[PDB]
């Protein structure tokens, strides 16, 4: 979560319904627009940000939602447009020994603006006595650790999430994939819409 990754996706047709058909997602909530509606729309760039968060905090990754992992780390604005997808992953991610290789940001001095990421390890410390780069009574690694194990109950087990953020810019849109394929019929009066010739 602290280094939430961002991938730019562009100049590419995509089938959103390939994600929709399975339909076992804990979420799939689409704040920006309807899930079925996604295929025919054209957007200039889609930014797919992926992180692993415990089950209780999957709700926090929503427009205008306030909580520890939706404030200090990844935060989405009131005007944010996109679809959020999530699914359980107790086998693939967690390990019996105890997965300790995901870490979250529990102390941050200043709130983070929308879609902003900070990878800094700069000791935070609410309070006076100048704490250095060495932690102490009120100085703290601002990246305390997630602990993941298989026996843990649903809501604490890892739930990897994607936050597609389809966006429009003034330049020609590229991300744009409908299918709509129906075989042509010849020698008949037919209503035809080819690649936009109606």
């Amino acid at each position, epitope marked *: 979560v602290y280094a939430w990754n961002r991938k730019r996706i562009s100049n590419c047709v995509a089938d959103y319904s390939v994600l929709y058909n399975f339909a076992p997602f804990f979420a799939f909530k689409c704040y920006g627009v309807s899930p079925t509606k996604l295929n025919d729309l054209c957007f200039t760039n889609v930014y797919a940000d992926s992180f692993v968060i415990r089950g209780n905090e999957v709700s926090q990754i929503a427009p205008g939602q306030t909580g520890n992992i939706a404030d200090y780390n990844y935060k989405l604005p009131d005007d944010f447009t996109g679809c959020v997808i999530a699914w359980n992953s107790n086998k693939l991610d967690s390990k019996v020994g105890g997965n*300790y290789n995901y870490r979250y940001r*529990l*102390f941050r001095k200043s709130n983070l603006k929308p879609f902003e990421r900070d990878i800094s390890t700069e000791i935070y410390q609410a*309070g*006076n*006595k100048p704490c250095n780069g*060495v*932690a*102490g*009574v*009120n100085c*703290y*690694f601002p990246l*305390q*650790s997630y*602990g993941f194990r298989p026996t843990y109950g649903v809501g604490h087990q890892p739930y990897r999430v994607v936050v597609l953020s389809f966006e429009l810019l003034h330049a020609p849109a590229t991300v744009c994939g409908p299918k709509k394929s129906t075989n042509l019929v010849k020698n008949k009066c037919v209503n035809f819409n080819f690649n936009g010739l109606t």
Partner: antibody, heavy 116, light 107 residues
């Protein structure tokens, strides 16, 4: 998440003691030592950090050496210059918001008493 | 080593009432102070999280808040837990220290 502490017992003065704390279900990344004098107000004695920095009590310095067995998920406390003040109940504490100015989960509390 | 001072030394209250016990600070902490609950033969549990906000360890009704020199604790009309000695933990300078505490009983 259950914490068990032991190794505290009646001891002759000047003696050095080992306090064994078992940390279960969580790391020893943030921990502290807290003591309540019997029939008296509690007094903080030591703290450990993710960096591994050790801060000893202002009142008693260097008599107690905190040992963080992070590999064994356990905590140990050394004893030096035994005094009437040292006798108390020692509780392993995760801390409130880390040691965010205080403590949160506790162990059971080990008795230590000096006796000449 | 701020010398925390807590009042009153003893308190006695029954049911459906608010119990006031005030602690004071040698140096005023701007927004940080901690309260604890200790029962006979029991383990202390956090009541105020160094005043980051109202803290758990009790239902929302049991919240008492003070600032600067005057800090106070009071519990709403909700039925009281067995009256317990309550302590106040310093929240800014090492060593975090424990307030003398107020003994609590029932009559």
């Amino acid at each position: 998440v259950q914490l068990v502490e032991s190794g505290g017992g009646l001891i002759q003065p000047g003696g050095s003691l080992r306090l064994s704390c078992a940390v279960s279900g969580f790391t020893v990344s943030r921990m502290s030592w807290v003591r309540q004098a019997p029939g008296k107000g509690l007094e903080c004695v030591s703290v450990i950090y993710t960096g591994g920095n050790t801060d000893y009590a202002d009142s008693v310095k260097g008599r107690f050496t905190i040992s963080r067995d992070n590999s064994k998920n356990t905590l140990y406390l050394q004893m030096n210059s035994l005094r009437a003040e040292d006798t108390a109940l020692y509780y392993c504490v995760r801390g409130s918001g880390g040691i965010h100015d205080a403590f949160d989960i506790w162990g059971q509390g080990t008795m230590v008493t000096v006796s000449s | 080593d701020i010398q925390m001072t807590q009042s009153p030394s003893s308190v006695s209250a029954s049911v459906g009432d608010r119990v006031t016990i005030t602690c004071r600070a040698s140096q005023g902490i701007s927004t940080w102070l901690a309260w604890y609950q200790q029962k006979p033969g029991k383990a202390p549990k956090v009541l105020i999280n160094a005043a980051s906000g109202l803290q758990s360890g009790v239902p929302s009704r049991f919240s008492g808040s003070g600032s600067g020199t005057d800090f106070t604790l009071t519990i709403s009309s909700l039925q009281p837990e067995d009256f317990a000695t309550y302590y106040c933990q310093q929240a800014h300078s090492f060593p975090p220290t424990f307030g003398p505490g107020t003994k609590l009983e029932i009559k």
